[PDB]
Amino acid sequence: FLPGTNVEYEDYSTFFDKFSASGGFVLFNSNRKKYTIYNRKESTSRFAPASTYKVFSALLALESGIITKNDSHMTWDGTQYPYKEWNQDQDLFSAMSSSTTWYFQKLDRQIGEDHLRHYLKSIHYGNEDFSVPADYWLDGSLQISPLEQVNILKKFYDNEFDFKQSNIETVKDSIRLEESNGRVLSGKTGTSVINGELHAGWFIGYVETADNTFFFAVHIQGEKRAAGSSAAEIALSILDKKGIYP
Structure with a gap:
């Protein structure tokens, strides 16, 4: 708030x-x-950010020079991951759309825990906690609330964190999804397994209009396997209910 x-x-x-x-x-x-x-x-309770965190993971990577707008290509090992979309040469833009986890993971490992922890503190992301570079944003060490997501997403959009203007724009394009009427939708899904047959889902982002900007975050918990998709659908129906996004 x-x-x-x-x-x-x-x-x-x-x-x-x-x-x-x-x-x-x-x-x-x-x-x-x-x-x-x-x-x-729920809106004030923190949860593992999951793939929603890739937006900031990508921003640190750019700011460090680990990748650039022009060269962000990353050939894949050959590992047969459980998802056919991960099993191919990735791109910053392709990794985001597909949430190709290995891409950002090998991106987080290049930066290191020391520089990683420093980052979470520099932008005060959620509880700022961290386990290991490979899964701090998935294992539940790092947690942020739906409300916190919205506030920091605005800081990112407005660039109150004062990062190179170029990288902000780059991360912005990576998550821009659609453009209808006169509004542009940007967002990112997140899925986590909380037990057993009970999954968690995230869908954060914003809507840009001609004279305004709406920041939103939805977090869910249910028996839907693809919680990230269901949370997006929910946010979207609500967004369409208040006439913010058609």
């Missing part, structure tokens, strides 16, 4: 019910400096 704002509460249960899921929804109106949120408890 940024200083100099106001909060509103709404019920979107039915949108979550459609996917046999429970979770939260945080939306932020820049112009109105207003937050609209469903389920305050």
Whole structure:
């Protein structure tokens, strides 16, 4: 809850019910400096960021010179991963769309734990915790709340972290999804297994209009295998319900 704002509460249960899921929804109106949120408890509870963190992973990689807008290609070992989309030469842009985990992982390993921990502190990401370079953003060491996601996503968008203007734009393109009416949708999914047949899903991002910018984050928990997709669908139905994104 940024200083100099106001909060509103709404019920979107039915949108979550459609996917046999429970979770939260945080939306932020820049112009109105207003937050609209469903389920305050979930919206303020931290969870493993999962693939949602790739946005910042990518930003650190660029800022370090590990990769550039022009050269971000990375040939793949030959490892037969459980997902056919990971099993091929990746690109920063292809790794994001596909959440090709190995790409960012081998990206995080090049930077190292010391520089990694320093980073989480430099942008104060969630609890800022860390286990090992390979899975800190998946194993539950590092956690951030749906509300925290929105606030830091705005800091990224506005570049209050003062990173090279060029890299921000690069990460922005990597997650730009669609453009309808006069609005541009940007976002990123996240999926985590919480037990057993109970998965968690994330879908954060923002909507850019001609005179405004909406930041949103949805976090879910249910029996849906592809929680990341279901959370995106939920956020999207709600977004389309308030006429923010057609």
